[PDB]
Amino acid sequence: AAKDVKFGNDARVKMLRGVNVLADAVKVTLGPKGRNVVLDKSFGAPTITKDGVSVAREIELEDKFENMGAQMVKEVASKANDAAGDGTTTATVLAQAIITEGLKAVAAGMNPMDLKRGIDKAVTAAVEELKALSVPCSDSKAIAQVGTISANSDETVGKLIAEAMDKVGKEGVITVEDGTGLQDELDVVEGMQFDRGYLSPYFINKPETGAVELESPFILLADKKISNIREMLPVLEAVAKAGKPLLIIAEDVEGEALATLVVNTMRGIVKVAAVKAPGFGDRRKAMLQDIATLTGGTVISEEIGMELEKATLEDLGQAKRVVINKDTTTIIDGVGEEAAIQGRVAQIRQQIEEATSDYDREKLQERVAKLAGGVAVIKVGAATEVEMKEKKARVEDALHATRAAVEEGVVAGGGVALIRVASKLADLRGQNEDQNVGIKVALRAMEAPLRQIVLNCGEEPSVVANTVKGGDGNYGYNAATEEYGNMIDMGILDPTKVTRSALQYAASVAGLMITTECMVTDLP
Amino acid sequence: AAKDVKFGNDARVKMLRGVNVLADAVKVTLGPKGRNVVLDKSFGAPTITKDGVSVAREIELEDKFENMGAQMVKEVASKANDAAGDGTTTATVLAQAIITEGLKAVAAGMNPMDLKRGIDKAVTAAVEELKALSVPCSDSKAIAQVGTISANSDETVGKLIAEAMDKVGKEGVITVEDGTGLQDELDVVEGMQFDRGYLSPYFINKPETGAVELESPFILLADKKISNIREMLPVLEAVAKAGKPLLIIAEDVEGEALATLVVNTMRGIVKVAAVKAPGFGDRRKAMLQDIATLTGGTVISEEIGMELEKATLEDLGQAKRVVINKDTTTIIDGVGEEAAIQGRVAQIRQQIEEATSDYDREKLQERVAKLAGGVAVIKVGAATEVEMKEKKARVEDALHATRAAVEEGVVAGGGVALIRVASKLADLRGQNEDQNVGIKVALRAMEAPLRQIVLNCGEEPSVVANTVKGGDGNYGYNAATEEYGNMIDMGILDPTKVTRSALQYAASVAGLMITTECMVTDLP
Amino acid sequence: AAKDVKFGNDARVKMLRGVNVLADAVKVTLGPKGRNVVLDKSFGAPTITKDGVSVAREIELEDKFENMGAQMVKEVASKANDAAGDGTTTATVLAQAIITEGLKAVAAGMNPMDLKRGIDKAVTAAVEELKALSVPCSDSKAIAQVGTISANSDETVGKLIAEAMDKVGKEGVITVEDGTGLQDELDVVEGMQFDRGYLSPYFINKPETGAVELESPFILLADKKISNIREMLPVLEAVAKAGKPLLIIAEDVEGEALATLVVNTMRGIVKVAAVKAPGFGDRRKAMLQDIATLTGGTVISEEIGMELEKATLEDLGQAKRVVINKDTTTIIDGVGEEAAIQGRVAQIRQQIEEATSDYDREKLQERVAKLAGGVAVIKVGAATEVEMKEKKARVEDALHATRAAVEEGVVAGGGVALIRVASKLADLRGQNEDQNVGIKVALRAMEAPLRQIVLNCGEEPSVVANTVKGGDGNYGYNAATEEYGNMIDMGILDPTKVTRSALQYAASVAGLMITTECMVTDLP
């Protein structure tokens, strides 16, 4: 299509207008006296949300140039989210601030590419300075705090996540789903459990729970899929003359094999369960192996020169107890050589180390939690469903923000950390005067989160800032209670990784943004 | 469709307006105080870019005649890019200059076809003169310089490319990809490696890296695809009674053959790896042969009257070590008769000589680097992704510009080279007066790059030009530091091939362009 | 659809307006001080072109009547092109001239159908008169001249074509393709070569060129397609005990036959090449026979009661040398009975005589050049691609114009020939006064090419014409150098066939055109 092209100031005024519309819609949600934004959706009912990235992803403007503005800053809030899990509003507010101040300098005759170099240098230094301030964050109290601020000052969410990490460990997974009741609930699985129900419903040996309860049984791990009773006979026999029940985790069990297995336990010849393998593709055999380690059995892998029939009691795993329902199978305390478990763990632990993406990282720590430590689920309660959605979204947010603190500590919230690094860098200079203005531009921006937080409370933002800047260390404003104090003592902590990440990303985009001299888009 | 036809001056005024819109959008990015252009894309987020060709390819105008203007000059920036890899803005700026000055002469009553002959002659001479000035460019310092100017005055990119060419050689390949971290990184493979993972994941003899490490093994090169264990038995046997492991590079390995091979190493009968062949079609057998040379083995080609079963230890290649992961296979130091390697190299080296295109040139030098010298990868670091894209684009640009310098040396940057050849040709004349004006038109244009560079700094372009033209040799303006000096001493070097190529292409298009008396297009 | 119908003067004024728009766009390119026209193309980049027919084929107008005008004259320029290869602008300019002058007479009350008879008679006479003036054109100097004027005064193209015809002969073919370098290049194949690469890439006995070089070999010509090694054994045997290599030109070679043939030369049992047959359908067997004649072998045609197995050394052709690469096969100097070659030639030479079209003429002389004389390729050099296209187009144009001169001599260019025949016919009369005006109308038109040539130079066209008409024989204006002289001495020659053809076609269309009293078209 024919393109519209705009130059210099005109391009820039339009670009900024774009940024503002997005920035302004996101800003209204920053801080404890943050308000909500309503997001239309033809699809279903509208969405109420405080979550900065969520507002951002919906802004698209009609004026094609303004659009371009918004579509670019949208990336800071977006990137923040993918890395941190929180701070997306802060990120956005910093980005809008650098831009505003930037373009003002560009209009002063400054050289944009230098203003950028300044901003960038100021940021590299602020990041270093934040590493310094961070106190690491490792004790449950600090963790609960980031969780709390993350969840819009909701103490219970803090407490709940803190408790979670305490029980599953560091190498352990925590998921969040909808609860049934009105109140939140934490479930910890001790052991190992995976998403798999019985293939034979006519096996339930306890109709009360509607589940199979195998007492101290053997475990057969079949890599290949079963369909014939033939392959079983040899091993099924040794189990029949041993008394103990048997769980069979195969790729699949079908045909008459499954059908017969029923008639065998139905009579009381043997007690035998059949459940599919956890996973799909190459992941399945990986996870199936994990189970062998915890139970002290051998995977009967058809691929690596093994028949199902040549197996003996030797290759069978063993557990203290087994629980299987329509949806999930649980092994409570397998035999498992102690050293072999943690050996297999420290191996999968280093597989996450060289995991060449994010998905090759997720599933890996999932399995480590199943084997280690443990796995925890947070169930979120709410009265309605619009409530469920905004609450589940906040607990998900806090869950990320704590994970970030743990890997990268905490710093004084209320955006004081940022204000503190701005005075430390009061003496930073560049290679020339334009680079200098570029530094002062980032420093001045570093005040903006605090300034918006206060502005959302209906209070004088410059007056609060003046008096926080009169203080030292962790002295800040508590917007909730309307009085000044030590932010760490008042429990107002942001995780370092998030504050850092907000800064780095806003700087990255806004830095580029201010160097714009020409814009090229489609005609209206 | 019915056409609109415009004549003479009207056609030309419109054609020029077109050129300007494109020229003006490209111009803003020229030089160290160049700014960026934003390019819309419904598709994804907008693109920020300094890269002249990238802006050019997006301009399309609404007025159908103006469009034609822009669509034509767009070819200089485009052609520059395909040949050089850099200089696309310069090219564009020269082209706009010749055109402007041209049409002014045409409006004076000059004969366009003569103005063209003049321009062309002036250029043929400027090209000769540049060959003279070029000092060749062969030392690492000079190379780093073109790299640096190419990458918008980024010393690290210079250094990094210079280092690269130093290690891989002249007949060696350098690619550029996204890095994981924040900083750039150079990887050199010593040896030979190709894009191929193990077909049998159950073979990894080192679960730490998740890779297969065969110590001093034999190598079987099967041209045909394997599916049966039969063909292996004869050779697999001689390897079993020799102790040493065996790598099998076939067209494919599947069926029970693959399946059995697993059970054989799983037990410790033999140590055997299976990986597909590098490539596809006729290229595969070509590349497969290369491997035989480096290892001292024979390709067992089913096509040329050979059975896989009639092979002995004789036909197997041998290496010091082998490393195979999920994605790539590496041979570290094969047996390879020294003379036979470089013999096969100087053969493939002359295959590039008679390579009847560009693709028949690319893959060829790729293989030579795998065998010779070596292959290097530059990994680009950035904080975000909009940064990654503009940075990766600049390193790609520098990588080309150095390759051009090497094949065709360096000259004083800042567009001084061009200004220098313009005074050397002060005494060039043609067959008649119109041809003369045609020469003066190109000479006057030769000043434009310097003139734009200065104009993008917000400084008086004619005043800088006057004082550079007062000097000699390599004396120029350093736009970065705002002071005059010797451009080669200050490290501001452009590669000759690029400066030449900018000129030739702009001249070619603008030369034609000014001879336009009538234009024929579709109705609005 | 409902039609619009216009009568008499109204129809005619519109028809003329149409003609003019097309005429005017084509006119601007006539002569050495001709300018270019730009032709839009959504498809790719616009086209710059001097070539009259190319401009013509693009004009289509919006006013449906004007359109009809243009769509009709478009046929003169089109027809000129198909016959001559050049003169399309001249043709157009004459046509516009006859029309203008015609309709002026029709408006005087003259009877159109008589004006037509006059024009036609004037033309039949002008054609005769041109046959007289033509000096034949047979010497290389004259040929180079038509070539030169054809290629817009480009001496090198002249020289290059003249050289070409000199080497291939009269019964020989010259093609034109894109070159790699900057300069033009002439390639002459001595012998015979056809578009066919080896089917077996594993045969190259010289890896340096990547081609097969069979020294003094036998040649097998198989009409049928081969797939089985059986049929070969008998003959392949006699060649194996003779020492000499063997080329096999079959319809196709595949299956194990091809596969085995490899293993046979790979070992050194026999040296044997396999290439498909040149052509397709009935043309293939025709061309395959040609090869037999040059080599002294028999076509083993399965259709005419012959088995491939019953062949002996007797039926095999023989050559001095053979060269085969991936794309083409060449026979250097076959055994061939001298008389039998030229006998088969004078036979195919008369097959062109009774060739009932143009395609049955093209391929025929192609084969004669392969056998006779020889075949030549002109490779065109240019810096860019817009240059390549306009240059290749001019060399193609000159190539045609010389071929026309050869079959139908040269005459004084600058359109003096035409001006000369106009004074010879000063005394031509018709059957009545209207026929007379009709003659004067054509004569007056005959001046127009000269008149446009001059007008494109910015000079007084009537003043030049007056002074050329004051002269005699070959005295004319040299528009390039701006002085009068003998056109043949100055090398400004047009080929007779083109000048004639321009005239005949313009006359034909414009003759009809002026007899128009009513026009019927679709509604706007």
Swiss-Prot record, chains A, B, C:
Phosphorylated reversibly during heat shock. Can be UMPylated on a tyrosine residue by SelO/YdiU, probably under stress conditions. Each subunit is composed of an apical domain that binds non-folded proteins and GroES, an intermediate domain and an equatorial domain that binds ATP and is involved in inter-ring interactions. Forms a large central channel that appears to traverse the entire length of the cylinder with no obstruction. The central channel of GroEL functions as two cavities, one in each ring, that are separated from each other by the crystallographically disordered 23-amino-acid C-terminal segments of the seven subunits. The entry and exit of polypeptide seem to be restricted to the apical end of each ring. Pfam families: Cpn60_TCP1. NCBIfam families: GroEL, PRK00013.1, PRK12849.1, PRK12850.1, PRK12851.1. Keywords: Acetylation, ATP-binding, Chaperone, Cytoplasm, Isomerase, Nucleotide-binding. GO terms for cellular component: cytosol; GroEL-GroES complex; membrane. Signal peptide: none annotated. ATP binds at residues 29-32, 50, 86-90, 414, 478-480, 494. It is found in: Cytoplasm. GO terms for biological process: chaperone cofactor-dependent protein refolding; protein folding; protein refolding; response to heat; response to radiation; virion assembly. This is Chaperonin GroEL. Transmembrane segments: none annotated. It comes from the Bacteria. The modification N6-succinyllysine is found at residues 33, 50, 116, 276, 320, 389. GO terms for molecular function: ATP binding; ATP hydrolysis activity; ATP-dependent protein folding chaperone; identical protein binding; isomerase activity; magnesium ion binding; unfolded protein binding. Changing residue 397 to A: Can bind ATP with normal affinity, but is defective in ATPase activity. Binds non-native rhodanese, but cannot release the protein. Its EC number is 5.6.1.7. It catalyses: ATP + H2O + a folded polypeptide = ADP + phosphate + an unfolded polypeptide. Belongs to the chaperonin (HSP60) family. PROSITE patterns: CHAPERONINS_CPN60 (PS00296). Its main location: cytoplasm. During the substrate-folding cycle, the two GroEL rings separate for effective substrate binding and chaperonin activity. Ring separation is triggered by ATP binding to the trans ring of the asymmetric GroEL:GroES complex and avoids formation of functionally impaired symmetric GroEL:GroES2 complexes. Activity of the GroEL-GroES chaperonin complex requires Mg-ATP. UMPylation of the chaperone by SelO/YdiU negatively regulates its activity, and may facilitate survival under stress conditions.
